Ligand binder design. Structure first.
Ligand SMILES: C[C@]1(c2nc3cccc(C(N)=O)c3[nH]2)CCCN1
Ligand SMILES: C[C@]1(c2nc3cccc(C(N)=O)c3[nH]2)CCCN1
Ligand SMILES: C[C@]1(c2nc3cccc(C(N)=O)c3[nH]2)CCCN1
Ligand SMILES: C[C@]1(c2nc3cccc(C(N)=O)c3[nH]2)CCCN1
Ligand SMILES: C[C@]1(c2nc3cccc(C(N)=O)c3[nH]2)CCCN1
Lengths: 350, 350, 350, 350, 350
């Protein structure tokens, strides 16, 4: 039987859960009869991305309908949604393209997870636990609840979580230290870059197999730009509250996963409103969206050079921003070093 | 084409939505491969109820396990849940039986809805809209947004909805007046009973076909008692906030349905803590669970004799109660007269 | 002596107050010794705008300093700020250009007001009150406190003002009905455009002479784009709280002015994040920035066809927006019809 | 049997309740064995007042103890408090004298009530209800719950009651219109004085017999001045929250009484901090203590000339005051016309 | 070049800023054309104080106008305010005299600062930084951010700052240890007095040159008494929130200065309402105004004998007070030992 610790074994079952994949798809109204899990394709998803981009263009130009109707019908022909009646919803605005793209993003990681869950040798010489674990290409270790690392992290979570949106309370059930294969050399260069911070990154549970196996990725060129406040990059927050909302947990499934990564920010280009760049000013190596709220700077803390902004949340200098929280973006995956993964229990106050 | 107004036509598509049925089942982790919608049976559900009751008994006695294991395995053999690994959850406590029973309740109405959605004559001499509408055996009319009825109702909803649990805001999209076949004579007697009130009753969208076609029903004898604070009856609230939580809506599906019914309460037996009776004291005809919060009595209002407690929520006399809201229970379905049905939009504040 | 009502006479003294102009300039650290009020020039302000735009460009490119230093020194040579020591602040980021542009905007209206306050015939055949009043080219009337108009407006102000940012409370001291010369024909066309709404527009008191005499204007081409979430246009809000923050009042001067204008919106292009367009999609005639909060739609109200969204503030459908409040933008001044002007007393809670 | 309405009969039993008198005395730690109700004397209470004033003087001078000890022993020799051990508390500070004076105030009205409850003819030719009612020398009438008067009053109570100190909620159980003998001519003069307002005045239930029979009175000369922010006068509030705190109700006895009186204020001398005057500036006829909170002026309302400030509570112009609420004081009892008396139910939120 | 640390150099530029002086004067509506900075006189300010006192007297007596008009005209003849029209405001009430006195207080320290900024030798043998520094006659040192002193102070600031008036958040930018010449011997005596506490004292930035050079001073005899709740003395608070409001910072200038001083309180005379004494009871050496809120006593802390009440804010025993916060007053400047000065950044939540 697996020599893996019990908490890791449970982590493995969580991310490679087929029922969870199926559930996310039905939550999207996708018809599994026509589009089963094993039938998801990458080229199919790229095609869908392209259509979405075309809708956004049609929307910006103000297409004289008809074109919007055909594009909409084309999208649903590729992504078989079952509605029954009322007819398929029309994709005629930014809000609509954003939702569909967010879905394609998730469906791609599910496709990635299903494709890994079915490879190599589906024999039993070894239990499914250790095999699937190996497929992640990531070394996973449990962090003792009573250590220095755990204390810092828990405080990070406890302090950057306030009451302004306290629709729930956070409880850390498990803390894992992580270092995926590949993310141990690639970073070494950007390490010779100042302003490295330990930041939060939340994401749907059904995307973690893809995230651990492939690392955080930047949206492909066929993907619509709408939905990314600061262009196609990798986003992080310094307040657990901001990231936790991307875990999409609920009273039904109050358990979610969240990452903590070391990101070599370098000189940050500061902005207060959405701006599509990806182009970056000379000398800048990241973007910091300025939020209304920020961790108490006096409470900052470090270690090895990586700053950890676990100060309680206070009002920042500028409020003339649309953003509520800080937001950090990098446009090179090499600037990111995934360090920890937290299994969190969301208790809703309701 | 259907002569029904557009809002009613939309109501019809909502309650007879197969994708919605399928989605509620997958949300329960049920494996549709083994247990498709068309395969749901009433006797199967009664059997499942019986097992649940046996678990509750085993739990109260403190069964020396083994018996709990076999009962648990028996439940999952009847209700095929797909877990993958970790093994099926053990049903060894009140909290566990309550969740499963709540599920069986919902699965029964879905079974009822699927069985109605497939009967009579699946021909096309008439569009599916009018046919399915007739299957409800309920007369449905739209209440003009600018009428007296609509004004009273909206205020009822606006005032009994506070900020203590404001995880969302309520918006009335449609208001329907209703009178199902059968619920027009049966009540006439209990009408000759004082203390009639117009109260709220929320419920999952997927249960409305069953509710409209069969009316509100009291739990069967095989059903576990755990989960019903005051025995097997029909529950109502006088604060929309209390009932709205049973609609189980979310950011994904922020739309829900809620009923308003006239209930001939008669003399109410007042209690402050859960009590399983169903037996009722001589001269009493209902139970009022006393809550910490209550609509402002000064703001009460009537019409035809039916009191409408739309006063804003204030602290009640007694707080020495566990209950947060008032709760009304009747043990005879004839004491209930369903009058209106509201389509509501839940806007979460998050 | 002036036949004007006392409240209008007081309004006149307010907007044509020289001490107020002088005070706004010193608040900007401007040195009146070098740059007196009478020395402000329009070409000087246009030049300053150009420099600011050049800084923004330098900032976006990431100019290798030196260029940033010379541009900064050029700006302060044109706009003489007295610092004393520490040296002039460097304009090397978006946040810096925005503040300076906001200042140039205000300084231009002050220049406009000073230029009107000194023209025609500074004789005394007529008192300064009626003369200056005429210079506004706007017909001003007092709205009786106990009328229908006043009631609607006050409710508009009372309901769209919540407690989330209740750093103050609002009190309407005077309500004026207005129709400036020119804004009585120019609009007639766009009146034949649907979706006309009565919206709020706040602004510094020292800008009202310019606003009444010239009407709301769209930023000139030399002006930096940074600072306008949706391009150079005319912005309105449907929640008095949003607009009131642009009055820049305080415990020292708790009195401010705010406008209510009828804007022929037409088809609104809906967005959730900043987007510089001005280009507009075919068929769209305005932009609606979607906020997290919005007036209760059920409470909407009209008259003559102009909708007045005085519903209390509730959570809107989407929160996936950066914006807190709704925001409406039009890119043609003819789409705007200034109707009322309110003198408001801000009571801070502190 | 009494022809008095039931609500008035209940009012009568409330204010002439001996058990209530006894209870207030034991709440004061007074030993009824030594000082029974029937043993309370007016001269005894005046003597006690004098001692208290002497303590205040000793406190202001900073008496070298001993004098403080003898005065303290003298007070407790007159007012027999049972402590048991620890010894009698020392009266050596303002806070101590204030509490004792407040007690003497209450004990005097109880003495007054007991002295009325035992006079004339304790025969039974008439029931105790009508007799005691007559002893009040006040004409009492019930105000129908569905009238104009009741509506105004209830709104007055509902709006001037907020959430800042919402340790309870208010419910009006009975509303009485009142006009005591004597207070129907005496006022006629001051009626020819502007600025008449309908204000709140709360007070312990055990003081109402004295208040109805003798009217609101100003503290006697022997009484300490400490405790009266603005000298010995008659105090009123324009926010039910302020007055309700002087009813001293609780979860045990959540029922209290509160008055509404018409007071001919005249020119008000405005102050922001305690000031002992009673001397009043020429032309002023009352004092208005300026509070941080005040009823919304726009919502003011009148009738017959008496202003009723039932506007919801908002932040007032000045916060540089110690006072939280407005407070009105008059130094001539003739300036007061008691109009209504409300029986209120306090529901604590706890 | 100056050997002073950079943070001290910045402190020096802050308090000796001429633009800041000019700005405070224009904020007062003072006409710099008539009353330039260099034209401010001490005798002129004393004269103005006298007039204010005369107005207060006229107000208390209730002067039959005319006298109020002449006094008002006399005040504005001495203090040249530019209004333009509407005419000069009438000084006919306590609220008016308080504002004017507060202004004279500030104008005097500005006069003091301008008089120091222009003395000795305006040569350049030494840079203006070290010269002006010497003129303060105060030894200034920077306290390392990571020391014991800094930790205690920051906690003092973080805990005595709540959410009840959280219109802003506090950030300590610099912490200076201070000991002015003279305040090193004078205190030695009162050090042999118990109950020494480290308390807060806020003040306008433009008053610090005067405060450091002359120390905290007690109002002169010609000064009005109105405005000083407990007579002319030196006031301190034990909750940073109370003192911070006297820094008069804003979104425009969110930076302020605040002092921490050791005050030898001795026996405190406790009061709950304003009381003009200065006379003090035998054995008492200070006054403590009792507030509704107070630092958690359990969290008290000391060092060398000086208590530091940095407990979080909790409800105090008595609420029967007008005061919201505690307030300490001493009537001998020798009882005060200025120890630290904090540069604070105010972040408004708005
Ligand atoms: C909306 C979007 C996003 N913005 C974020 C800001 C802070 C944190 C996260 C996170 N995932 O933890 C964010 N995710 C844009 C890129 C993909 N999803
Ligand atoms: C938990 C339970 C329930 N209690 C309620 C109290 C007030 C209202 C409702 C409602 N459905 O609107 C309630 N439903 C017990 C019976 C079935 N579900
Ligand atoms: C920041 C900016 C602005 N945005 C607004 C949104 C709603 C209302 C107003 C207003 N003035 O009442 C706004 N003003 C951009 C254009 C000039 N000032
Ligand atoms: C404390 C004191 C008092 N101050 C008040 C201010 C507003 C209302 C009332 C009231 N009784 O309704 C007050 N009572 C001083 C005079 C006797 N009691
Ligand atoms: C209003 C007044 C004042 N009262 C205070 C109470 C606590 C602290 C302070 C402070 N300056 O930090 C105070 N200042 C009266 C004397 C001058 N200003």
């Amino acid at each position: 039987k697996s020599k893996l610790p019990k908490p890791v074994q449970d982590l493995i079952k969580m991310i490679f859960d087929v029922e969870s994949m199926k559930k996310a798809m039905v939550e999207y109204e996708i018809d599994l009869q026509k589009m089963p899990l094993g039938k998801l394709s990458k080229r199919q998803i790229q095609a869908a991305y392209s259509i979405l981009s075309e809708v956004q263009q049609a929307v910006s130009q103000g297409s004289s309908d008809s074109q919007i109707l055909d594009l909409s019908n084309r999208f649903y022909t590729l992504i078989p949604h079952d509605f029954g009646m009322k007819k398929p919803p029309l994709l005629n605005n930014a809000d609509s393209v954003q939702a569909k793209a967010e879905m394609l993003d998730n469906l791609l990681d599910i496709e990635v997870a299903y494709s890994l869950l079915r490879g190599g040798s589906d024999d039993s010489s070894k239990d499914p636990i250790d095999v699937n674990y190996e497929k992640l290409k990531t070394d996973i270790k449990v962090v003792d609840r009573d250590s220095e690392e755990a204390e810092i992290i828990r405080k990070y979570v406890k302090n950057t979580h306030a009451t302004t949106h306290n629709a729930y309370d956070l409880e850390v059930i498990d803390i894992f230290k992580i270092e995926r294969e590949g993310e141990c050399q690639r970073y070494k260069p950007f390490k010779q870059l100042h302003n490295r911070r330990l930041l939060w990154h939340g994401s749907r549970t059904t995307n973690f197999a893809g995230i651990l196996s492939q690392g955080l990725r930047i949206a492909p060129p066929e993907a619509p730009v709408t939905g990314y406040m600061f262009g196609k990059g990798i986003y992080f927050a310094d307040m657990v509250s901001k990231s936790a909302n991307y875990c999409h947990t609920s009273q039904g499934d109050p358990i979610g996963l969240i990452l903590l990564g070391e990101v070599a920010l370098g000189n940050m280009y500061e902005l207060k409103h959405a701006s599509h760049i990806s182009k970056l000013p000379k000398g800048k190596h990241s973007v910091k969206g300025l939020g209304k709220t920020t961790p108490d700077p006096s409470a900052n803390i470090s270690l090895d050079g990586v700053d950890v902004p676990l100060g309680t949340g206070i009002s920042s200098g500028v409020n003339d921003t649309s953003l509520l929280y800080n937001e950090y973006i990098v446009y090179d995956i090499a600037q990111v070093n995934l360090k920890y993964l937290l299994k969190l229990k969301f208790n809703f106050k309701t």
